[PDB]
Design a protein around this motif. Structure first.
Motif, PDB file in Angstrom:
ATOM      1  N   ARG A  45     -33.662  19.383   1.519  1.00 18.39           N
ATOM      2  CA  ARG A  45     -33.629  18.675   2.111  1.00 18.39           C
ATOM      3  C   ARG A  45     -34.411  19.240   3.765  1.00 18.39           C
ATOM      4  O   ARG A  45     -34.909  18.650   4.045  1.00 18.39           O
ATOM      5  N   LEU A  46     -34.134  20.324   3.410  1.00 19.29           N
ATOM      6  CA  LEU A  46     -35.520  21.290   4.343  1.00 19.29           C
ATOM      7  C   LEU A  46     -36.760  20.711   4.524  1.00 19.29           C
ATOM      8  O   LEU A  46     -37.707  21.172   5.679  1.00 19.29           O
ATOM      9  N   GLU A  47     -37.575  20.698   3.357  1.00 18.63           N
ATOM     10  CA  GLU A  47     -39.209  20.515   3.298  1.00 18.63           C
ATOM     11  C   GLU A  47     -39.768  19.483   3.753  1.00 18.63           C
ATOM     12  O   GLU A  47     -40.670  19.478   4.319  1.00 18.63           O
ATOM     13  N   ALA A  48     -38.653  18.171   4.099  1.00 15.38           N
ATOM     14  CA  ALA A  48     -39.179  17.112   4.602  1.00 15.38           C
ATOM     15  C   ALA A  48     -39.365  17.582   6.270  1.00 15.38           C
ATOM     16  O   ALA A  48     -40.019  17.120   7.195  1.00 15.38           O
ATOM     17  N   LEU A  49     -38.623  18.162   6.643  1.00 15.41           N
ATOM     18  CA  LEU A  49     -38.406  18.407   8.004  1.00 15.41           C
ATOM     19  C   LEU A  49     -38.555  19.265   8.571  1.00 15.41           C
ATOM     20  O   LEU A  49     -39.218  19.190   9.959  1.00 15.41           O
ATOM     21  N   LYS A  50     -39.890  20.170   7.440  1.00 17.44           N
ATOM     22  CA  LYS A  50     -40.198  20.837   8.547  1.00 17.44           C
ATOM     23  C   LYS A  50     -42.234  20.911   8.014  1.00 17.44           C
ATOM     24  O   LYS A  50     -42.781  21.803   8.230  1.00 17.44           O
ATOM     25  N   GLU A  51     -42.352  19.641   8.026  1.00 16.21           N
ATOM     26  CA  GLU A  51     -43.823  18.872   8.172  1.00 16.21           C
ATOM     27  C   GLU A  51     -43.647  18.683   9.080  1.00 16.21           C
ATOM     28  O   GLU A  51     -44.367  17.261   9.748  1.00 16.21           O
ATOM     29  N   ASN A  52     -43.535  18.853  10.469  1.00  9.96           N
ATOM     30  CA  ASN A  52     -44.253  17.712  11.620  1.00  9.96           C
ATOM     31  C   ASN A  52     -44.076  19.203  13.071  1.00  9.96           C
ATOM     32  O   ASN A  52     -44.661  18.998  13.995  1.00  9.96           O
TER      33      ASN A  52
END
Length: 20
Positions: A12-19
């Motif tokens: 879940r965290l992977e996606a959020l950590k790309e901005n």
């Protein structure tokens, strides 16, 4: 209990950590 579901949380965290 921390060798199966812990990975799930990372996912879940992977996606959020790309901005920033």
């Amino acid at each position: 209990y921390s060798d199966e579901l812990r990975q799930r949380l990372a996912a879940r965290l992977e996606a959020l950590k790309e901005n920033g």
